[PDB]
Structure formats: C-alpha cells, structure tokens
C-alpha cells in the first residue's frame, strides 16, 4: 500500500493547486491527478449530475489502486463526498470543505463564497454548524468567477467590478474571515482583498496537510528511490488547457494523457 | 414524413432562440429541442470532444424520426456539421454558419466574433471564402461572453468593459458588418453597438427561414389539426436552467424532460 | 434563521397546493419544495417503503437548514410523521392530517377519503378518536383518484363514475363532513359534491395557516420585502411541469434535479 | 449453464404474465422474476430515471447467474434495452418490442398503444421502420390504463369510457392491427375489441415463444429431474400486491422476497 | 449458432498465436481473425484512443456473426474489455488478462511485463487483487519489445541487452513467476529466461484453453463435415506483414483481406 | 494572408524538429503543427495507407487556411507528396526529401537511411538520379530506429549494436555522405558517426530555410513583433509530451486533441 499513488480528484483545472501543495510537503509521493475537462464546469450543474460524474471519477481512481484520495474541488466535496467515500470503501478520502471548516470553527461570524452549486447545496454552512451551530455563516455565490479566471481575467478593473458585484453583500455583515470556497478564487485574492478587507481563507494547503498527517500517522509513505511519477489524466485537452492548468500548477504537466469515463 | 417533428440541435441554452423563431414562421410544426446541458459549454472544448458529443445528440434525434435538423449552435456547426450530416443520412441538416455566410457574402470586409472553439476552427472564414476568397475576414474569440450572459450580466458597465476588451481588435479594420457568431451574443447587441458602430448580423432567423424554404418547397409541412408538440429534451436541469433558457425562448418550456446520452 | 427557507415536504405533485397557499399568505417567505417524482406514487406502497423514502427526504431537507417543515402529503403524514420529526429534531414540523383533524373536532359523524396507504394506516380515525372517541369516523380508500387526476381526468362522466364507485359507501353513514385526505382530491371537488352533498374539508389551507402561526409564535417570520422559490425533484418527466403547475397555479421559478442516493 | 434459471425482468406486476407463459412453454426451467414494486410505475417517468433504475435491476439479475433474460416490460424495452444488454454481456436478452415488431412487419398500417414513456420514446415506430420504413405507424399513449387495471377496473362501463377516450385517435387511421404495447393491456382486450375491433397484437406471448426458440435451437434447455424453482424478487410488497399479481400470474407466488437494489 | 465462426480480436500481428493455438485445440471450428494493422501499435497509445479503436473492431466482428470472441491482445484487454463485452452483448468474450490471472492466483509475489498502456492501466494488478488482494504485484513496461520483435530481432545480443534493461527492475523483488503480458513476448522467452530465470506465464495458451472449455461445456462446438474456413481481416497489408505474421501463426494465411472500419 | 500560420505537416513526433528550426529562423511566425499521433508509425505501413492518412491531414490543414505547408516527415514526403500538393492547390508545399536532395547534388556517391516505407518507395534514389543519373545512391532501411528512439534508447551499447546491423552495409560503398532520411535519426547522429565516418546530411534545417525563401519570394512573411504555436494531435498518450519536447527542445505552448474522422 505504501508505494501506491495519491489520487487528486478534481472537476477540472483549479485542483492542480493541490498537486503543487503536495509536491511541496510530500516530494517522494506518486500522484495521479484526474480532471473531467470534457464536462467542466461542475459549478453550474445539478446535484444529480454532479453525483453521477463524481461516481465515475471515483471508480476510475479506485481502479488505479490509489492509497488515498483528496477531493480538490469544493463543488464535488459539497455534493458528492459521500458518493465518493462509498466507492472508495477502505481508502481514505480527504476533502477541501473539511479543511476550510477546520480553519474557521473558532470564529463567531464567517463569510463563504463559492460556485452556485456549492452555495446552493448549503454544504459550508451545514459543516460549519456541525462544529458549532451558533457560528453566523453568510454565503454568496460568485457565478462568473470561474470562467472569468479561466479566460485570463485575473486582475484589473473588470475583475474588481465583478468582485464588487458579488462581495458587496458582505459589507454590512461584520464577517471575521471569508472562505475562498472555490479552487479558482485564490488567484484573484489581491482583488478580493481590495474590496473586502478581511482575513481570506484558502483551504487547499490545509487539505494537503490533512492528507500528510494521515499518511504519516498510518506509516503509508512511499519508500521507493525512483523519480516520483506525476500523471495527469483528463477527459479532454482543449487548446487553452496547458496554459490555464499550469497557471494553477506552477510547473509543467509533463505526463498528460487523454482518458475516457465511458466504461465507468 | 410530413407530420414528423423538426429537431433543433443545440449545445445548450442559446439555441432556444431558434425554437422561438420557428414558432413564429411555422406555428403548426412539432419541435424537439435538444440541449446537452450536462456538458456545456462546448465553446471551450476540443474539436475531438465536440465531435464525440455531437455524434451522440445526432443519433438521439434520428431515433426520434425528425424530418429535418437545424443546428442552432455555431460551435457544433463549425466543428461537427459533417459528423451530424453523416448520421442524419437522407434527413436534411440546416446550420447557423451557412445562414450567417449567406448574409455577408456580398461584402468586402467582414468581422466575426464567436466562441474560442468556433474561431480556432476557422469555420466562418473558410465558409465565407468558399463563396468568395477575396472577402477580408477578421475573427476574434470572445471567451467570457457565454458565461457572462448565462450569469445574467446582459447590459451595463461590466458588459461594456468586457466587450471593449474583445471588440477593440476591430477598430482599425474597417469592417462592414460584424457576425454575431454565437447564439448568446444577440442578447447583448445593444452593448456591442455602443462600442462598434457597424451592422450586426444575427443568423438565427435566417437559419429558420432556410428550414422553412426547404419544408415548403419539398411539401413536408405538418397537416395535423392537434396542438403542436414542443418537447425540450435536456441532459441536465440545474437550478438556473429554467430562467436562463426562457430568457432566450421568450415563452415557457412547458414540456421538459431529463434524458441521457449514455446509450448513444 | 428568519431568512432561512420553509421546506414543503411532499411525495410528489399534489403538495404544490401548499406552496400556492404559502405564496398567498406568506408572500415574502422563501420556499424549498421537495418532490420525490422518481418514486411516486407513495399511496399504493407499503408502510415500511414509505417510511424509508420519507427518512431520505427529511435528511435532505435538514441539510438545507430549512427553518420549518410542512408535510404536505397525507400519506407521509399518516405513516412517517414520527420518523420525520425524529430527523428534524428542533425544526418544527406541521402536517396536513393534524390540520384536517383540527377542522372536525366539533362534529359527531365524519367521513374520510384518502389513498389506500393512508386509509390502511387508520391515521385519520386514530387522530380524530384521540380528540373525541364519540365522533363516528367512516373511512374509504380511493385508489384510482391520484393517477386519474395526474392523467388529466378532472371532470366529466369518467370522474363521476369512479367517484360513485368510491363514495356511494357514504350515502347511508349520515356524515356531517368529508375530509379530502389526499392532496389531489380537491381538484375534483365539484364531482365529489355532485355525488355526496356534504361539507368537504380540504386541510391544505389550514396546514399553511398553522405554519404561519408557528413561525409567528417562534419569531421566525422573514421580514424582507422578491422571494425565491426552489423546486427540488428526483425526476422530471415530460408531463411534470404541466401537471405540477396545475396544482401550483403559477410557473415553477427554479427547478433542479436532485438525488437521494446519499440519504 | 443449461441448469441456470431464466430471468424475467419487469418494471412491476404486468411481467408476471410472461412468467405464466414460461411455466406452460418451458415447464422444466427455473425462473427468477424481478419487479421494482417500490418505484413503479415506470411508464410516467423520464428516460434518464428509467435507465438508472433498469441498470440497477439488470445488475441484480446478472448476480443471480441467469442464463437468459426476457425484458417483459415495454417501457424498459423502449428506453433501456441497450443499457440492459450491455450489462447482461454474454447472456442473451429477448425483449417484448422485438416480439411485437415481428408480428406486424407484413402490414401497411399499424397502431400502437403504450405508456407515455414508451410512446414518447418513439421506440415502436423506430423499430418497425428498421424492418419496413414504409409502414405507417400511428401511436397514442394510454396513461390511465396501468393504474386503472392495477386498481381492479378490468371490464365494465368505466373501462369502456376510458378506452373510448384513448382509442378515438385511431378511428380515422384505417389501421390493420393494434399493438397492445404494455403488459397490462391484454387484461382488458375484450373491452378494447368492443371499441376498436381490429386485430390485437400481444407482444408478451410472442416474446415467450422467442425465448423457447433461443433455448431450443442453442441447446440451453434444462433437463434436470429436480422440481422447477420459482423465485419472485421485489423491492416492496404493497397492500394488495399478491391479489393484483395473481391476476396476471394465475397461480400463487410461493417464494416472494424483498430485496434492496441500493448497492447497485 | 454452433456453426458460426470464433472471432480472434487483436490490435495486430501477435494475436495470430491464438489462431495457431485454436487450429490445434479446435480443428473443426471456423475462425475469423481481425487485426487493425493500419493503426498499430496500440501499446503506446492513450486509453481514450484504444477504446475508440476497439469499439470499431468489436462492431465489425459482431457484424460477421461470430459465436464467441477471444481478445488476444493484452492492451485491448486491459483498457477496453468492458467496451468490447458491451458491444458483444450475448456473445461470450474471453480475454488474455483473465487467463493470465488464473495462472498466478495461488502465488505470493508476481511480476508483470507488458506494453506501456497495459502497465499504466494497472489492469493486471487490479485483476490479480480481485482474486487475492494480498498478492504482491510488481509491474514494468517493456516498450521496445513489440517493435524489436516485429523487426525480426528475436534472439541474440541486442535482445539480451534490451531485456536486461527492462528486467533489472525485478532482480530484487523475489518474484515467483513473471507474466508475459503481451502477445509478442513468448517469441523471446528463451532470452528472457537467460536474464530472469523464473517461471514464465503465457496468458495466450490459457486463453485458448478457456475458450475450448466454454464451447465444450456450453455445447457450442462445430461438428460439420465442411472443411474449416479461416479468414484474416486487416486494415492494412504492410511491407513484411506476411513474413512477420507467419512467425506467429506458423502457417500461411490463405484469405487475407483489407477492410475499412471507417463506417463504425 | 501574411498573418496566417505556417503548417508543419508530420506523421508524428519527429517533425517537431522543423517547428524548433522555424522558431529559431522565423521567430515571429505563427505555427500550426499537425501530428497523427493516433496512427503512428507511418514508416512501416503500406503505400496506400500512408496516402489515405496524408490526404486527411492535408485537408485538415487547408481548412485552417495556412499560408504554406512544410512536410516534415520523409515518409509522407516519399509517398504522398503529390496527393498533398493536389489538395493544397495554390498553397505552396516544401518537403524534406527535396531539401535532402538539394544538399547532395554536387557529390558522386551517396548513402541514404530511412524508414522501411521510404526506402521501399525508392523516392530518395529517384529524386537524386533525376538531377544527376551518375550519382551512385545506396539505400538501406533502418526499421527499428524510430521505436528505439521514441522509447528513449538514444546512446550507448544497444544503439551502437542496432546501428551496426543497419549501417555495416555502407562500409564498402565509398559514400561521400549519408542522408539521415528520417526525422528521428539526427537524435542518434553520435552513434551513427561512430560506425560510419562520413558526412551526415540532416535535411531538417535546409527544408526550414527553403520555406523561409518561399515566404520571402512570395511576399508572405509575417511582419509582426509574441507568436502563437498550436500543436494539433490525434492522440495524447502519457509519454507524448516528454518525447515530443525532446525533439522540440522547448515546451509545447498550446496543445489540442483533434479528429480526422470527417476528413
Ligand atoms: N472546477 C470548478 C469548481 C471548483 C470548486 O468548486 O472548487 C467548476 O467545475 O465549476
Ligand atoms: N452554447 C454555447 C455555444 C453557442 C454557439 O457557439 O452558438 C457553448 O456551449 O459554448
Ligand atoms: N402524492 C400522492 C399522495 C398525496 C396524499 O396522500 O396527500 C401519492 O404519492 O400517492
Ligand atoms: N409496469 C408498467 C409498464 C409496463 C409496460 O410498459 O409494459 C409501468 O411501470 O408503468
Ligand atoms: N499488438 C501490440 C500489443 C499486444 C499486447 O499487448 O498483447 C500493440 O499493438 O502494441
Ligand atoms: N514519424 C516516423 C517517420 C518520420 C520520417 O520518416 O521522417 C514514422 O511515423 O514512422
């Protein structure tokens, strides 16, 4: 089990940051990244469809005999965590919403921004309230942010105006921190910080640390002496993928392969 | 054959305008609209994947024994028209790019805006040049427009600034007309007209008229006396679908059903 | 908390009447409707199946952090009210049977028509006799009514003949009122009236009024002045919008396909 | 292999007729019936849901090691036949639509009645036209029939009136035969014949004949001396289930066992 | 049914060994071989492409009315087995991975060599672990072997050196057997045994035995007096194809016919 | 027209060398690379198959309205140059065999190594003997080289032994130069040199220079001062970026999976 890869489970593109994080704390581990690039975005799809898609990716990863899964995507974590856990059986699953919650559960008043699917699922408020039901949670979807960022609008006047549209909801709420509850949003954190001067919470590294602690405590660390294998399995490769993905990864996606979920 | 439905073939959401158009010129015809809502957008996907998806929708429509197909989506028309035609066999296929070309092929200098997939496919320039190779064609993708419009940003300062970003390319080109080469773009035509004061070409109604002429000349008109049947078959129904779709349709999508392409 | 939605808990389709009522009497409340359209009808299924299904919907609604639940379906109310309440915990639950019973507690002879499951459960008679054992309660299931109505047979000779088959039972019972103990039956009240000349009790509005009272007493009224209406369903067949909107009497604002697989 | 059971795959209740037919045609075969009684009817559900459900049943049946399957339900046959066959790989699958089509492919004008789902799927017309594209097929849903029959309304004035409502569609069509394209409809064939007195085609018996032919010619017949075993697996045992089921089966179900499909 | 041919389904060239084995084990059976010689190798292609190709071949074979299929290729077996079985509905499909797994499920430590695609798919390890999750499986791709062998390098110093490069991975693994998980590798088994002298497992012969068992026990054996017919369908006849193919088949291909799969 | 891209037409992988060359000598030209990665290798396939495949790629490239085409692959150039030219019509086509031949036309004895298909076609000898019939041309296919190189055997004892098997043929032929008549072979030029001490002719740069000349003569040079590089391929297996980028010597900017099914 020790020398099996870690599965990084994404909807697509923004979860590459978890790969980056893992490479910084677990440099000897093999990683399989999965992105369902053919069917993104998930943030604007129904709960039934997000669950259907996540069951397929889960089965694909389990067939690769990963030793652990991290769900990098907040939208999949919000809506399909249990579907994924049920398929993974004895394979542990770490998720980014659990990570986010762990960073705010001593506050009194918390804001959350995320995809429409995530916010409409109510997952962040529910999970925060499982820790403490008296934490005040204010949530607002930021529907345009994902496409905006994928199209390269990552700073400047457009980004600032779209952010004002979505973040003005929080001005009278006296929040103590704002959860960046979508993988894409930390890219624009500097623009967010200009509009809403509060602590911004990015749960990706925390999620990676949770996976580190689990592997360490359970003695499931890779002890091979060969170069780690980083495999990027995706269901589409459109022309902009290399450039937008590597904006998140911060290094080359050197071993990239087109796969299909047709049999899953 | 006369009393079979017309198939309106979309990627999703914006092709509903063709249904509206058809209902205005062919009020006695049954219509089946197909939208692959589960996997939109197509505008940012690869050619291989767009072809794969379009073959599935084509097979679904042919199994419903439509008498004609109109491809409402510029992205599918650009990349998968031949795939669809091959599946349809003796069933005629009308497409929106053919319609657009028919509206500009006596000009000297033409601009085109469309999805990244459409513009990168080169389909509009190629098809215009098939009519006359000496027409000057200037093309620019407007990647953010589709999501922007689906998120409800349809006028105002954000729309104007995003449009300035994409349309400034045309200011020195002396174009005689600008093809609105995506179903979504006519929604924002007033904002476009503020930035680039040229004739805007919306090919949807022309495409519908092409289908009318074909049915009329071939004596394939519905002569039943019952209420026409309008069926909206979609592969997902997310929460925003009703409202955003009916913004394009301009009337209620009264008979709506979730379907699957898994067997296609 | 007062800006959280109300949850309308249905088996499917007929509970849209409760949404209509709440839109009227509580025009500034947000509402989440849940319909298990994939698995309807409930009215001809077993007790244990209805309980299993209802537990899943209850868990779904509690995950949404609704501020209150109204069980719009008589069948779920008859069979699974306790399970729903156990899942809802401190979230208040109003149900349509409690509403119906409240409208007859000054009478001495009452009839009840409902689904086969509701009648089999004997919930209406039990809940009435609990308040006053001397009230004579006569019950009769009307199995075909739900499908008949969903297929658009809502007046005319077919409806009258099916109704005569189920209602003739009441002619010699001297009832002072008939409880329409299924969401669907008020649609055909004109045909029912024709056959049985008695006061017809429709518990829908009273349930909605009880919910208003509960929100007022618990200080849970939304004070805002445009509400949002979400319709979460486990299936969307072609006929769903037409039939549903027949009960709702307006168009469904926002509709989404959801799954209970994880519940 | 030849001593494994035959699977009768139903939505619920009406498929028991095929069990009855196989008890007479193949008296030495073990039979497993499956009915998804918890979730019926299928006839009023979407294509996506019918396919989801049928995939779970098919997987349950394969796990019982059946040697052949007959899809007794027209609604599953119309919408999910390919899903079922793909799951039942090497196991042959006979369906009632194929049976029905085989009885009419010599005619010129054919009527079809079925559930809303079956008619909306266009499956009968499509499959007929695979054999002879020139046959005129007229199709009309009879939505109330399934519940009406299950509630015990099987003859008399109510049945005649409902039948008049649905069958009036055919009076001006000059059909040569009417396909009773739902398992339930043969129960009320005497009433149908009073209203529309044309040749009535019952797919269920022909499906049973096709299964015999498949087993006989392919040498898959059971010749053991152990008494045949009949098992009826259902997802619910509702109120009047035995009495309604025994209307179709015409004998008692000796082993009736509730199973859950939730693991599939 | 029993007089229909057996299909041998290959990527190309190496599968001819299975034809050779069936000529000896089942001398009275008609055989159709298919090799996609225009598009080989499959071993260095993506999962999505291997699945696309295998779906076309499978459809061609079903159209020849075969009664059973053996997937001779480990690469197709690893990646596209479910695709093939779903297309070959009722037709039973034997695969070489299943055969290989059946020969090692009594051991504790197993090595596997195969094409890059086969190893990257994890199929051998996964399938072994379905039977016994505690077996230690060590897998290494031998990418150059297929071309090397096809170019006629089948013994000698070059073969020994390349083999040393690939098999050095196993020297410290204490494996009890090595699965020769590619059709080509048994050709160089004497060289492999010089370098890594452990029990060598050849899936191809075991697959042929499993097919005999299936036909014998299921009564699908051909007993006609007409001479067996052998057909070899290929998508190309390249330069030295007969000479290379005859290395594996060990007799001449009497009917070798180019077909196109483009319609599938 | 001068802002249209150049098309680099490959079978797959090795033609990336031509992209590298053009990035160097034409730094402001946009480039579309096409590789039929799904169906490689071409070098061991039949003449008719190579022609069928090449016609599809040619049609794809013409649909993109490239301003010129360079056939980077010796195998396509040997077998399908006429088909590509017939499809390209007024779009100029440069090919690597014409380039290779141009570099030897002052010699009298020449060797050529290439794929089995290229050598079988006899294209190099035919095109050389056409210019001067007196030049002695000796040809030998090197079938294993393409796979060997793509699998990363690019130096050392294995490469030397395979090379000795194919090149020993030339020891007694008194050649003045050897044409490396396959895109892949320059990768192992150090091992080739070891065995055969003769001038090695790599036609890649000369083909790229001929394209420059053609663009200059036809007034088709892009005058702009950041170019865009698109890599269109029919498959992307795991090893593709590593092996491709070995030939390209930089990272592929923009990569897209495409299909020739409609071509
Ligand atoms: N990849 C984004 C979702 C990312 C997230 O929610 O963290 C999408 O598919 O919409
Ligand atoms: N529906 C849009 C494309 C519409 C069009 O190109 O006309 C999308 O999927 O991106
Ligand atoms: N929706 C009806 C029951 C409604 C009611 O009992 O109030 C059903 O599922 O049978
Ligand atoms: N059992 C019926 C369908 C039977 C059939 O279509 O043959 C239902 O579930 O609606
Ligand atoms: N024919 C080989 C694969 C053979 C096998 O994996 O068994 C290829 O195409 O790469
Ligand atoms: N790409 C090589 C041929 C390269 C060349 O001949 O220049 C192949 O497909 O075999």
CSV table of C-alpha atoms in Angstrom, one decimal, chain D residues 1-2 82 85-93 217-220, chain E residues 1-2 82 85-93 217-220:
chain,number,residue,atom,x,y,z
D,1,UNK,CA,-25.2,-23.3,-17.9
D,2,UNK,CA,-28.3,-25.2,-19.1
D,82,UNK,CA,-29.3,-1.3,-24.8
D,85,UNK,CA,-27.9,-5.8,-22.9
D,86,UNK,CA,-24.6,-4.1,-22.2
D,87,UNK,CA,-24.8,-5.2,-18.5
D,88,UNK,CA,-26.0,-8.7,-19.5
D,89,UNK,CA,-23.0,-9.1,-21.7
D,90,UNK,CA,-22.9,-12.8,-22.9
D,91,UNK,CA,-26.4,-13.5,-21.5
D,92,UNK,CA,-29.0,-13.3,-24.3
D,93,UNK,CA,-31.8,-10.8,-23.8
D,217,UNK,CA,-32.0,-24.2,-31.1
D,218,UNK,CA,-29.0,-23.1,-28.9
D,219,UNK,CA,-29.2,-26.2,-26.6
D,220,UNK,CA,-29.7,-24.3,-23.4
E,1,UNK,CA,-25.2,-21.0,-33.6
E,2,UNK,CA,-22.7,-23.8,-33.2
E,82,UNK,CA,-15.8,-3.7,-20.9
E,85,UNK,CA,-18.2,-7.0,-24.0
E,86,UNK,CA,-20.9,-4.3,-24.0
E,87,UNK,CA,-20.9,-4.4,-27.8
E,88,UNK,CA,-20.7,-8.2,-28.0
E,89,UNK,CA,-23.8,-8.4,-25.8
E,90,UNK,CA,-24.9,-12.1,-25.8
E,91,UNK,CA,-21.6,-13.3,-27.4
E,92,UNK,CA,-19.2,-14.5,-24.8
E,93,UNK,CA,-15.8,-12.8,-24.6
E,217,UNK,CA,-19.3,-27.3,-21.5
E,218,UNK,CA,-21.9,-24.9,-23.2
E,219,UNK,CA,-22.4,-27.2,-26.3
E,220,UNK,CA,-21.3,-24.6,-28.9
